[PDB]
Structure formats: C-alpha cells, structure tokens
C-alpha cells in the first residue's frame, strides 16, 4: 500500500513516538511510529474541553451563547485576556474559562457524568478544575476517536442540541463540502508529556472519519506540529485533501 508508505514517511521526520488513529464507524486503522500508543491511556489535556462543554450544557451550568467575562486580572496568555463564549474558548483553548465551567459543574456531578458516559477511566480525584491537566483522568486514543465519532453522528448520551452545539464549537475549516472539526491538547504537567490532535472530517453526504493524533511531547517542542502533521496525514490518506 503506497498510501500507507506515504503516511509512514511523514513520521520518518519525527523523533517522538506517535500514533495516528482513524475510525469510520466500522474499522479502526493505526499509523505512526509506536502503534501501541493507540490502546494506551494518557491524560486528555485540553481535548477534555469537548466533554466539559457537553456536561456543562447538558446540566444547565452554561449555554452556548453565555459570555464568560474576564475580570481584568492578567491571565497566563494575553490571548486569554478577553471575554469568551464556550465556543470561542474552545478554539483559543482558554483553560481558565473551562476551569470556571468545571467548578460550576462541581466534583460530584462531574464524577457521576463521566461515569455515566464512560469517558476514559472516569477518575477525577479531588480537584475538579485540574484532573484533565494533571491526571488522574486518562483516556486512550481509540476511546477519543470513538467519542468524537459519536459526537459527529449525534449518538452520545446528551441532548441532540447539546451535541450539535458542541460539535460546531469544534469547527475549524471546510474544503469543498468537506468539514474539519478538531481540538488540540498538550499535557505538559505530566511525564512523559502528551500531545493530542483529535477530531473528525465530515462529508456533505454525512460520512465521517474521526481521527486522533497522539504523540510524546517535550519542553520546547513546536506547538504547531500536532495540527500540521495531522493535516498532512489526512491529506496523504485522501480523507481531507489539500485544495
Ligand atoms: Cl493545546
């Protein structure tokens, strides 16, 4: 399969252990340099924002139009020093906004909801605004792709409109009638560090291919690489051709 060879060559560039998983609703396929990562659990990092948003909307702790106001105290990034909706905060990965959401949900409800939907190992520990950044919550790349595949198809155990609104929070770009939805993550606070790019490509006719890049990161790594590599792979696969 020369297409597989083309994809694997993309990983020849890269010293970090990496896996790229796809799911089309029938079959799981794995690419990369360490395929066992696909069935290994890692902290979700900011990919957890998907589940956080679903849980927050489902349980009336926020709406998709509610503005989370900045209080005026400088945040870690100047990019975060503004008001955000949950969708805007999704694309900017505004951690303090989603920490506020998590505290609205609270530890009892967060724990019962993660158990209800079977998200990863469903463990949150005692800090409701830290568990996706520090652990103990972990999830495998295969679990991630099945989760977002179900989101794409509206088959998660949430209200239809809750799922649809969080789905569009993830929208990145379209090419022709093909749509890319995705969320990055970089679990820096744990060792080894984990890098994620999770999402799906939707065609006009409704067909969906979900994907997850999962790779080892280290201090000083290029922040843009997760998305770039994922787009390069999706193009080589013909799932999301470059225009
Ligand atoms: Cl990120």
Swiss-Prot record:
The modification N6-carboxylysine is found at residue 49. It holds the Pfam family Transpeptidase. One of its GO terms (molecular function) is penicillin binding. Activated approximately 3-fold by the presence of 0.1M NaHCO3. Keywords: Antibiotic resistance, Cell membrane, Hydrolase, Lipoprotein, Membrane, Palmitate, Plasmid, Signal. A beta-lactam binds at residues 46, 49, 93, 184, 186, 226. One of its GO terms (cellular component) is plasma membrane. InterPro entries: Bact_Transpept/Beta-Lactamase (IPR050515), Beta-lactam/transpept-like (IPR012338), Beta-lactam_class-D_AS (IPR002137), PCN-bd_Tpept (IPR001460). Changing residue 77 to I: Reduces catalytic efficiency about 300-fold with respect to oxacillin, and about 30-fold with respect to penicillins and imipenem. Its main location: membrane. PROSITE patterns: BETA_LACTAMASE_D (PS00337), PROKAR_LIPOPROTEIN (PS51257). Carboxylated on the epsilon-amino group of a lysine, with the resulting carbamate functional group serving as a general base. Probably N-carboxylated at Lys-49 at neutral pH in vivo and undergoes complete N-decarboxylation, at pH 4.1, in vitro. N-carboxylation at Lys-49 probably increases catalytic activity under physiological conditions. Monomer. Dimer. PANTHER family: BETA-LACTAMASE YBXI-RELATED, PEPTIDOGLYCAN D,D-TRANSPEPTIDASE. Belongs to the class-D beta-lactamase family. This is Beta-lactamase OXA-58. It comes from Acinetobacter baumannii.
């Amino acid at each position: 399969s020369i297409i597989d060879q083309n994809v694997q060559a993309l990983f020849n560039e890269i010293s970090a252990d990496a896996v790229f998983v796809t799911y089309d609703g029938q079959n799981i396929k794995k690419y990369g340099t360490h395929l066992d990562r696909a069935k290994t659990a890692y902290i979700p990092a900011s990919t957890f924002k998907i589940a956080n948003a679903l849980i927050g909307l489902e349980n009336h702790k926020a709406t998709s139009t509610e503005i989370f106001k900045w209080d005026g105290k400088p945040r870690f990034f100047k990019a975060w020093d503004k008001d955000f909706t949950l969708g805007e905060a999704m694309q900017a990965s505004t951690v303090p906004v989603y920490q506020e959401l998590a505290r609205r949900i609270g530890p009892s409800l967060m724990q019962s909801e993660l158990q209800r939907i079977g998200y990863g190992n469903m463990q949150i520990g005692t800090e409701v605004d830290q568990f996706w950044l520090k652990g103990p919550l972990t999830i495998t790349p295969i679990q991630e792709v099945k989760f977002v595949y179900d989101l794409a198809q509206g088959q998660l155990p949430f209200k239809p409109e809750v799922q649809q609104q969080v789905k569009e929070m993830l929208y990145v770009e379209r090419r022709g009638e093909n749509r890319l939805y995705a969320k990055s993550g970089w679990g820096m606070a744990v060792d080894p560090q984990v890098g994620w790019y999770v999402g799906f490509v939707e065609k006009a006719d409704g067909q969906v291919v979900a994907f997850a890049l999962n790779m080892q990161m280290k201090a000083g790594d290029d922040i843009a690489l997760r998305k770039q590599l994922s787009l390069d792979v999706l193009d080589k696969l013909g799932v999301f051709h470059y225009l």
